[PDB]
Design a protein around this ligand. Structure first.
Ligand SMILES: [Ca+2]
Ligand SMILES: [Ca+2]
Length: 701
């Protein structure tokens, strides 16, 4: 369906103004006027055309080639003229299982009909003539290298289509701007016209005529826009200016700690004394940063999960010479734009700033599924990976010594550093028109070039998680790079993140761009500052269309509502923001609160503190422990219930006097206490908390 001959249709007689670039499955190379909706009626007259590709014969014979316009045609087979402005009865021997280059040129001055009715025929020795079938035709080898059987360049005889990078799109089209128009059976590539295409809302593409892949990634500009590409590649990365490459980090879902057995203790019948905790993991970025690394930071839930208030050593019976080990459930996460097939990158589990506790590896070439973009390995419909799997004898115990154990208890955090080793790439093959994992193609050969020639934007508009995209961008100092189209900050956001302009105001999912901040690495900031000064602009938000991106820029764009830590994880928000987010009270009673809270807001809250304030201003805190804040839960209808009874010995609030108040406070992640105070205090005393509800007993009901 994606196979056949490649056709170039021109409105001039000398192959200079290409109007349509498309492919035909069979020897019918015709384009009826009905398919020329995206072309000015003036430009629907084709005075010249060129087709190229390959013919494969299934049975050796003497073949005579012909077209419907022999008098206007010159045709070459393997550099050999077989038709030249006249019908030829000349027969050529073709051998089964061999591939022959085809090149066909056509010229007709002042056509009276729009479009083109053109067919290519062959005749066998038995005198059977027919339009050359689809099984006998193949596309040209539009790659950076030849196949063993398919040469990547067409014959020198005759006119050479101008395709400096051999991606299939004519030089002039990549520079000037092109659109791709969907048909049922094929794709038309056509010059951009401002009046006709803008009204349609079609995408205007520009690419480098000297870069087979303009984003320096492993898919060609032509492959991208024609759909001759891995279906798992992200939609935005079908734009020639958006890089398609995997981005992987590890998500830890929960953890279990246990004392390591030792040679001195022959007793293995003791009661289980393990410590199990949920965890939350966020990919992180570490002014903006210029390093291309994959890391995530894990937050271990501090809420009490066991009876008593013992130390971990007390709970697990660890003496000072004992060691402990950790088992966790994880998934790999691809937040990039291309899938991973045969390799999962290697991960270090790190405690503190530099300690490494484990090296996490999967079996190469044994993956149970693809790791697709915006997806997980294993899929969320399947069980996660246990670091120590029950079906595997040889999982390395992830062991900590006593002091490391204490440090983990004291910090309640781990780090997962993941390398960028992603294995082989599924590429398109023009010989069979299918996508397959290619042993000859590897991500480690592409990533450095992608990193060197693109601008990086990291954006958290999607659920406050950091998502990185790379957009092809000029490097003034690199001549090859200069050819690529100017990339503006505005265009970048539209094509890479799906920002849209419904009212002429740039928005992401309904949020104006002004609801996000801009942060840059030191060099990018100085660059952007100079651009603004040159533009005489005081406000970046009003000149996004005029701010030009360059290769190696690093841009960080964050939701303004939130406070961010050094890892750019959202950890809090302004008091007024938090208070406003809690203004919609659906229901209140002595058992709790029912509210509609923004999903993003919920993300930065570690919990709630509930208190009764008597008439004299004194306060009874019902959930009086740092580790008892976890009293909120998300209902099925997306509403939040704050549970007064949970840490009130399962009893609703007793309010002695209707004039007393019930005050509820939110505690943000950055204000969360994770360990008892040095004084040993475990109360909520001193916890920075935000009042989000206060009603008297008689107001509550
Ligand atoms: Ca090209
Ligand atoms: Ca190109």
């Amino acid at each position: 369906s994606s196979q056949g001959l490649l056709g170039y249709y021109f409105s001039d007689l000398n192959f200079q103004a290409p109007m349509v670039v498309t492919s035909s499955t069979t020897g019918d190379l015709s384009i009826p006027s009905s398919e020329l909706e995206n072309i000015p009626s003036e430009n629907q007259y084709f005075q010249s055309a060129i087709w190229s590709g390959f013919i494969k014969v299934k049975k050796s014979d003497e073949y005579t080639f012909a077209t419907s316009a022999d008098n206007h045609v010159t045709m070459w087979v393997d550099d050999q003229e077989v038709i030249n402005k006249a019908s030829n009865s000349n027969k050529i021997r073709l051998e089964k299982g061999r591939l022959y280059q085809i090149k066909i040129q056509y010229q007709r001055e002042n056509p009276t009909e729009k479009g083109l009715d053109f067919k290519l025929y062959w005749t066998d020795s038995q005198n059977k003539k027919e339009v050359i079938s689809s099984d006998n035709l193949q596309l040209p080898e539009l790659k950076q290298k030849s196949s063993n059987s398919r040469k990547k360049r067409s014959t020198s005889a005759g006119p050479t289509v101008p395709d400096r990078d051999n991606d299939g799109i004519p030089d002039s089209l990549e520079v000037e701007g092109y659109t791709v128009d969907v048909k049922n059976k094929r794709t038309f590539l056509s010059p951009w016209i401002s009046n006709i295409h803008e009204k349609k809302g079609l995408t205007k593409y520009k690419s480098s005529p000297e870069k087979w892949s303009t984003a320096s990634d492993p898919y060609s500009d032509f492959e991208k826009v024609t759909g001759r590409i891995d279906k798992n590649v992200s939609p935005e990365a079908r734009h020639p200016l958006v890089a398609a490459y995997p981005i992987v980090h590890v998500d830890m879902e929960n953890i279990i700690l246990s004392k390591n057995e030792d040679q001195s203790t022959q007793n293995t019948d003791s009661q289980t004394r393990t410590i199990s905790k949920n965890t939350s993991t966020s990919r992180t970025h570490t002014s903006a940063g210029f390093s291309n690394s994959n890391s995530s930071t894990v937050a271990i839930d501090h809420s009490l999960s066991l009876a008593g208030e013992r130390t971990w050593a007390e709970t697990m019976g660890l003496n000072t010479a004992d060691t402990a080990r950790l088992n966790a459930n994880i998934r790999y996460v691809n937040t990039g734009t291309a899938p991973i097939y045969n390799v999962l990158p290697t991960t270090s589990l790190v405690l503190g700033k530099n300690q490494t506790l484990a090296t996490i590896k999967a079996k190469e070439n044994q993956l149970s599924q693809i790791l697709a973009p915006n997806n997980y390995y294993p899929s969320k419909n399947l069980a996660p990976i246990a670091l120590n799997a029950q079906d595997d004898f040889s999982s390395t115990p992830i062991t900590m010594n006593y002091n490391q154990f204490l440090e983990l208890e004291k910090t309640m955090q781990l780090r997962l550093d993941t390398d960028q080793v992603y294995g082989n790439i599924a590429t398109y093959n023009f010989e069979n028109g299918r996508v397959r994992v290619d042993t000859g193609s590897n991500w480690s050969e592409v990533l450095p070039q992608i990193q060197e020639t693109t601008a990086r934007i990291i954006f958290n508009g999607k659920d406050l998680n950091l998502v990185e995209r790379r957009i092809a961008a000029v490097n003034p100092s690199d001549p090859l790079e200069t050819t690529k189209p100017d990339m503006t900050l505005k265009e970048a956001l539209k094509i890479a993140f799906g920002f849209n302009e419904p009212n002429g105001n740039l928005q992401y999912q309904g949020k104006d761009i002004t609801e996000f901040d801009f942060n840059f690495d030191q060099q990018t900031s100085q660059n952007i500052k100079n651009q603004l000064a040159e533009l005489n602009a005081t406000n970046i938000y009003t000149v996004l269309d005029k701010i030009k991106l360059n290769a190696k820029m690093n841009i960080l764009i964050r939701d303004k509502r939130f406070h961010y830590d050094r890892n750019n994880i959202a950890v809090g928000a302004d008091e007024s923001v938090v208070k406003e987010a809690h203004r919609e009270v659906i229901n209140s009673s002595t058992e709790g609160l029912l509210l509609n809270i923004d999903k993003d807001i919920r993300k930065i809250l570690s919990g709630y503190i509930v208190e009764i304030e008597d008439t004299e201003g004194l306060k009874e805190v019902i959930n009086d422990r740092y580790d008892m804040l976890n009293i909120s839960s998300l209902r099925q209808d997306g509403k939040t219930f704050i549970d007064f009874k949970k840490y009130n010995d399962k009893l609703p609030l007793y309010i002695s006097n209707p004039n007393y108040k019930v005050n509820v406070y939110a505690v943000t992640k950055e204000n969360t206490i994770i360990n008892p105070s040095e004084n040993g205090d475990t109360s909520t005393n001193g916890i920075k908390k935000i009042l989000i509800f206060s009603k008297k007993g008689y107001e509550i009901g």
